[PDB]
Structure formats: C-alpha cells, structure tokens
C-alpha cells in the first residue's frame, strides 16, 4: 500500500478525515495514495505518533512546527497551506513593529515606551516581540508578565493580568480580552497606536493596509527593523521582527513519506479543493471550523525538499521562541567558522587553537550546507565565491569583508594560440571549460554575457560539449570532465577539472575555451605548476579573447577581459556583522601578510580582508549588472538551497 496516515486531534477531525479517506477512493487509481485516520488527544500526541511511526502527517501552527522539529521528534515541513489567491499564493505572515513617523527611537530603545499588543499569548502581538526582547527584560524574568510590566512604562496587553500587573492595562484599563475592548486584536492594537495611546504596535504586515486606505495616511507610520533603523510600512519584507508560516503539514525527516503526502494533497485539492463543487470539500466542514486544514486555505504548495524546520520558521522566529521556552541569557563570543572538507577543517582547528578561543570550527559537507548553518546560527562565517554570495544574500546573509589580492579580479576567456579561428564573436559549437556552474569566473560572467547574445541559458545546446562541474550528469557539459565513478562532473576536488586551475587543465587537454581569472594561466605555466599536465606549458601558447572580437597575450589581460569580477567575500548574519568585522581584522593583523594544500578557507592569493563601507548587501557588493545576469541564469539553475530561500522570499 501507498497509504498516508493522517493524524486527527478531535472527533470532529476524525470524521472529516474519514470522509476525506472515502472520497479519495473514488478519484484515485488503485496504484495511488490512500488515506488512513489516526485520532489522538492533541497536537503534541500527533507529533509523537508521527515520530514513532504510528502516523504520517498532520497540519500545524508555527509554534507546533517548532515542537515537532525538536529531538526526539525531528519532523519537517512538507506541504504549506496557501491563502488569498491562486495567482499570488500567501504562505507566510510578517510580524512587524509599527511606529509613528519621527517618534525618534529604534528597536534597541523600547524600554520605557508605551506598547500595544493584539493580545497576550498571540504570536505577532506578544510571543514574537516579547520573545526577541526577552533578554532585555529586567530580572527576574519569571513571571513573564511582571518582567514586561517593568520594561514598557505602560501598555495595553489584552488578557494580561491587570490585577497583579496594572502597568499592562494602562492604555486599556481592565485588559478586556474581547472585542468590547477597543484595543483588542489587530485593528485594536493598531488603533491603540493611531489614537496616540501607544508608541508602538506589535501587529502583522497587513494590519496597516487593512486600516488605512490612503497612502497619505500610511506615510505617517514606519516600521522598526531589527538592525535598529526604520523603514516605510510597505517595506515589511525587509523590516519585520519575524516571518511566520501559517499552517504547515509536517512529516518525519527520514522515512517520509513526503512524496506520498504531496501526491495525496495535491490530487485532493484538484478534485475537492476551493470552488470544486463536490459533495465533499477539503476546506470546510459541516462538523465545525478549521478541521485538518484552515477553512480559509485556497490550496497547498509543496515545501522545497531542502527546507528544514529552522529554515522554514526562519532565524528571527526561532530565536524568539527558544527564548520563551528555554529562558537563558548571556553575560561576541567566538566566531564559528564553517569548513567544507577534512583539509579545511584541519587548517581551521589549528587556527582555532592559535586564536586562543576567538575562532571555533564547524564543518559541513557542502557549501550550501555551510551557508544553511550560518542562516540558522549553527555557524557564523565563511568565505565564498561571488556566485555563493548571491545565494547567501537571497537567503538573508550579508557580506562583511572582501578578500584582496593586489575593484577586484579580471574574468577572462583563455584559448590555445594554435587554433587561431576562435573569437568571442562566435564560439557556437566549441568545447568549453568552466570552473563550476554558478561561479563568478567560470559561469556567471561569461554565460551572463553570452545570455545577452543568444537569449536563453541552455548553454549545453550552444557549446558542442564541455566540462562545467555541477551540470546534470547526462549533460553535454559533463562530457569532457575527468572525474571517475560518482565523482564525474562533481563541483569538488575529486573532479580534476573543477575550479580555476581544473578549467585551465580542461582547456589544455580537451577544450577550446576556458573561463577563468587573469592569473590562472601565469600561475600554471613556465614550470610553476610541476604536475605533468602543466609542467611543460608556456603562457605564450595561450591567448585571451577580448570583447572586441580580437585576441591578445595572456599578460595583456587588463585590455582583454570579459569583465571585472567581484572578489570572494566573507559572509555572516546581520546580527554578527559587527563581531565578525572586529575579530577577523584583529586575526589578520596577527596572522596575515606579515594552506597545506591549496585555497583552504580563503583563496591562496589573498593578502588582506577589506572593509566594505557602503557595499554590505549582496546587490551592492556584486553590482546590478552581475545581479541582473544571475537573475537571467536562474531560469536554468539547479540550486536547491536557492530554491528554499526564494520560496520564502521570491
């Protein structure tokens, strides 16, 4: 059987689940998914059932998505309910802090102000802001209401205990826990700000737009960002306290059956979803409200498979809720560097002990895994090719420092001098060598420029064949690669044509054109590289293709390049930007220009780690032309972390 066991947490839900079961039988072929129904006492029991292999799937709110993720449950998000509309599916809501224009304070300045909350215990209006402010609250932090009552000078916090903590009901005497209190709920809490009662209102991104029809009025309001700046109210996507998913189907991390659940839910929406007019309807029940799914849902979206619960809830939300559950507070710490190999780890380990604690080490198996650990706080920093910076940036990370070599390197197209046919003007049908797909020199620049000329990104149909590590194994752009077994065409060291040098090797041995950097050929010719394939080459036998259509010697790169490359950059979270900026400059003035293999942690031709000033965004660091180009190349991108990040922020 291909059966999905759906977990119900009430008798009304089990009835609906059984009806679900029975109607699906009429629409799904016998080799298709079917439904079984397991009734438990509560969401937490469902979670346990699923983790114990007595059930398979349940739909949860964000706080339970969190519980479900914790050991020993280890469930993950697999399907999202969406709202509003088929054309523009709404999956998340943003908790925001709204304030009046020119009220003159930042998030790190909330102590002593007046606050408006939608209601005690509510997500946007209470658990998130109080969770993120947790360690700012005065001691003792239990009971929590007491500590909040001594942080804000006065508040309106519906359903708080005003009898014990009157300060909390100062702007709404009684703390009425119903719509009889004028300041209850979303519009209530917004109204509390608008009427001048409060200085800040903890609400959802949409609250302001639902209460103020004219832009003229909304301009009188702003949002507090976590980075202690303000932004306009329609910029909540870049200025929110937390991004939060509405309603999320979860499942075991290993053991699924993710695939079956999607095939089930997807077919269910297609026959029984919103507006499908059958006697059974997936998103209502005669038996009561919100049974197994929210009645307001318009359907389901598949959660990208790379996504785990920390990633899906997001860093700010997880921080907030950990604080509320654990309640632990500090009194820069150590920068946790991310290693990608045994050899990278060994350099990092001896860096750690040499830094005397200031640096610690964490490893992952791929760059993307490392980036994900930085997103979620398992790690803090690593250095990355510009192509990975773009991905890190789309995932909410920022560049802090650039690696310097001497404006950065030159991206160049190398060819054999002998074959004097080749020109930039027509490389159609030629054999190409790339460092890896998605890297600056190897891909993003050259194929960026190439995209403008052919108006598609199926480059495996432009070139005859090639080696471009990270391509699909059966692609013509894996035909020239030299890795054996599972390593063929892999973007790592077990593929000998991977990377700057690898791509040049590829040209020497098999290719017609190699996309690399200006100092690749010089460093691998004239006997400098002793390996048999490079030992006897001299740079005079190689030429560069200029945008002109002409060709020039290798050392002539300054007048014969494809474009200026952004340098490789250190990235981190905005919340560690300052600590990473400090420690690394303090570490490089100790261990800089004053690896045991090649290019470990930082490129080997790096002299110093440079300040960025105004370029501390991926867009500003890479430049707009680079970003536009990568945008065009995504149409053919295979990056599953990028797919996860963009699911959350299109």
- As annotated, the binding site for Fe(3+) includes 61, 93, 186, 247, 385, 409, 500, 568
Sequence-distant (≥ 6) Cβ neighbours of residue 596 within 8 angstroms: 343, 346, 347
Q: Are 127 and 254 in contact (CB under 8 A)?
A: no
Least distance to Ti ion, CB of residue 126, Å: 8
Q: Is 246 in the site for Ti ion (CB under 5 A)?
A: no
332-371 footprint of Ti ion as x/- string (CB under 5 A): ----------------------------------------
Specify the stretch interacting with Ti ion by CB under 5 A; choose among 223-231, 365-373, 437-445, 461-469: 437-445
Q: Is 122 in the site for Ti ion (CB under 5 A)?
A: yes
Least distance to Ti ion, CB of residue 62, Å: 11
Q: Which helix (H) or strand (E) holds 563?
A: strand 563-564
Scanning 28-85, the segments in alpha helix (DSSP H) are: 43-51, 62-69
Tokens of 19: 């009806």
Toward Ti ion, which CB reaches closer, 122 or 347? 122
Which residues pair with residue 403 across a beta bridge?
609
Instruction: Choose, by CB under 5 A, the member of 73, 155, 363, 440 that binds Ti ion.
Output: 440
Toward Ti ion, which CB reaches closer, 245 or 273? 245
Residue showing the smallest CB distance to Ti ion in the complex? 385
Least distance to Ti ion, CB of residue 61, Å: 11
Tell me how far apart the alpha carbons of residues 379 and 366 are, in angstroms, rounded to a whole number: 14
Least distance to Ti ion, CB of residue 411, Å: 9
383-422 footprint of Ti ion as x/- string (CB under 5 A): --x-------------------------------------
Q: Which residues does the annotation place in the binding site for hydrogencarbonate? A: 118, 122, 124-125, 435, 439, 441-442
Q: Which helix (H) or strand (E) holds 507?
A: helix 499-509
Least distance to Ti ion, CB of residue 440, Å: 4
Q: Is 444 in the site for Ti ion (CB under 5 A)?
A: no
Toward Ti ion, which CB reaches closer, 39 or 240? 240
Least distance to Ti ion, CB of residue 305, Å: 28
Residue 278 three-state SS: coil
Q: Is 124 in the site for Ti ion (CB under 5 A)?
A: yes
- List Cα–Cα distances, 478 to 63, 457, 484, in angstroms: 45, 16, 12
Tokens of 258: 């993710």
Per rule CB under 5 A, count of chain residues that contact Ti ion: 5
Tell me how far apart the alpha carbons of residues 507 and 379 are, in angstroms, rounded to a whole number: 37
Which of 3, 1, 78 has its CA nearest to residue 35? Answer: 3
Toward Ti ion, which CB reaches closer, 123 or 572? 123
Toward Ti ion, which CB reaches closer, 20 or 92? 92
Least distance to Ti ion, CB of residue 563, Å: 13
Residue 57 three-state SS: strand
Q: Is 258 in the site for Ti ion (CB under 5 A)?
A: no
Which residues pair with residue 335 across a beta bridge?
359
Specify the stretch interacting with Ti ion by CB under 5 A; choose among 54-62, 120-128, 333-341, 518-526: 120-128
Q: Which of residues 369-388 bind Ti ion (CB under 5 A)?
A: 385
Tell me how far apart the alpha carbons of residues 367 and 378 are, in angstroms, rounded to a whole number: 14
Specify the stretch interacting with Ti ion by CB under 5 A; choose among 226-234, 341-349, 436-444, 475-483: 436-444
Peptide bond before residue 143 is cis, with ω within 30 degrees of 0:
yes
Phi, psi of 363 (to 5 degrees): -125, 150
Tell me how far apart the alpha carbons of residues 633 and 650 are, in angstroms, rounded to a whole number: 15
Q: Which residues does the annotation place in the binding site? A: 61, 93, 118, 122, 124-125, 186, 247, 385, 409, 435, 439, 441-442, 500, 568
Q: Are 282 and 50 in contact (CB under 8 A)?
A: no
Toward Ti ion, which CB reaches closer, 43 or 280? 43
Which of 260, 217, 222 has its CA nearest to residue 240? Answer: 222
Where does this chain bind Ti ion (CB under 5 A)?
122-124, 385, 440
């Amino acid at each position: 059987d291909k059966t999905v066991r759906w977990c119900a947490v009430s008798e009304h839900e089990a009835t609906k689940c059984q009806s679900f079961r029975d109607h699906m039988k009429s629409v799904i072929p016998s080799d298709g998914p079917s439904v079984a129904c397991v009734k438990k006492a509560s969401y937490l029991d469902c979670i346990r059932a699923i983790a114990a292999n007595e059930a398979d799937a349940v739909t949860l709110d964000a706080g339970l998505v969190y519980d479900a993720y914790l050991a020993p449950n280890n469930l993950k998000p697999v399907v999202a309910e969406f709202y509003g509309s088929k054309e523009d599916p709404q999956t998340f809501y943003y908790a925001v802090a709204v304030v009046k224009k020119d009220s003159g304070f930042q998030m790190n300045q909330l102590r002593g102000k007046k606050s408006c909350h939608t209601g005690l215990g509510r997500s946007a209006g209470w658990n998130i802001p109080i969770g993120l402010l947790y360690c700012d609250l005065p001691e003792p932090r239990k009971p929590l209401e007491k500590a909040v009552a001594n942080f804000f000078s006065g508040s309106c916090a519906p359903c708080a205990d005003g009898t014990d903590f009157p300060q909390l009901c100062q702007l709404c005497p009684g703390c009425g826990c119903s719509t009889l209190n004028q300041y209850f709920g979303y519009s209530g809490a917004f109204k509390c700000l608008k009427d001048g009662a409060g200085d800040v209102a903890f609400v959802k991104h949409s609250t302001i737009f639902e209460n103020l029809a004219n832009k003229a009025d909304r301009d009188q309001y702003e949002l507090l960002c976590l980075d202690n700046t303000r932004k306009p109210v329609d910029e909540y996507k870049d200025c929110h306290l937390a991004q939060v998913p509405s309603h999320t189907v979860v499942a075991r991390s290993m053991g699924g059956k993710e695939d079956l659940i999607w095939e089930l839910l997807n077919q269910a929406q297609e026959h029984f979803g919103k507006d499908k007019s059958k006697e059974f309807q997936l998103f209502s029940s005669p038996h009561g409200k919100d049974l197994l799914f929210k009645d307001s849902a318009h359907g389901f979206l598949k959660v990208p498979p790379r996504m785990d619960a920390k990633m899906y809830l997001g860093y700010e939300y997880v921080t907030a809720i950990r604080n509320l559950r654990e309640g632990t507070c500090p009194e820069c710490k150590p920068v946790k560097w991310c290693a990608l190999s045994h050899h990278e780890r060994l350099k990092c380990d001896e860096w750690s002990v040499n830094s005397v604690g200031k640096i610690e080490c964490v490893s992952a198996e791929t760059t993307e895994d490392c980036i994900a650990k930085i997103m979620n706080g398992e790690a803090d920093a690593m250095s990355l090719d510009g192509g990975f910076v773009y991905i890190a940036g789309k995932c909410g990370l920022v560049p802090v420092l650039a690696e310097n070599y001497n404006a950065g390197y030159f991206a160049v197209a190398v060819v054999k001098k002998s074959a004097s046919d080749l020109t930039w003007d027509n490389l159609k049908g030629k054999k190409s060598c790339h460092t890896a797909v998605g890297r600056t020199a190897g891909w993003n620049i050259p194929m960026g420029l190439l995209y403008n000329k052919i108006n598609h990104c199926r480059f495996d149909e432009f070139f005859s064949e090639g080696c471009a590590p990270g391509s699909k194994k059966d692609s013509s752009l894996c035909k020239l690669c030299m890795g054996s077994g599972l390593n063929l065409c892999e973007p790592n060291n077990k593929e000998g044509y991977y990377g700057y040098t690898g791509a040049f090797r590829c040209l020497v041995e098999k290719g017609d054109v190699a996309f690399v950097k200006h100092q690749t050929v010089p460093q691998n010719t004239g006997g400098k590289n002793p390996d048999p394939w490079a030992k006897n080459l001299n740079e005079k036998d190689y030429e560069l293709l200029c945008l002109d259509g002409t060709r020039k010697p290798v050392e002539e790169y300054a007048n014969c390049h494809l474009a200026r490359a952004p340098n490789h950059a250190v990235v981190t979270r905005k919340d560690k930007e300052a600590c990473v900026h400090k420690i690394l400059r303090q570490q490089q003035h100790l261990f800089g220009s004053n690896s045991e293999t090649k290019d470990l942690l930082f490129r080997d031709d790096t002299v110093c780690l440079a300040k960025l000033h105004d370029r501390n965004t991926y867009e500003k660091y890479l430049g707009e032309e680079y970003v536009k180009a990568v945008g065009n190349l995504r149409k053919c991108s295979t990056s599953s972390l990028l797919e996860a990040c963009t699911f959350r922020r299109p």
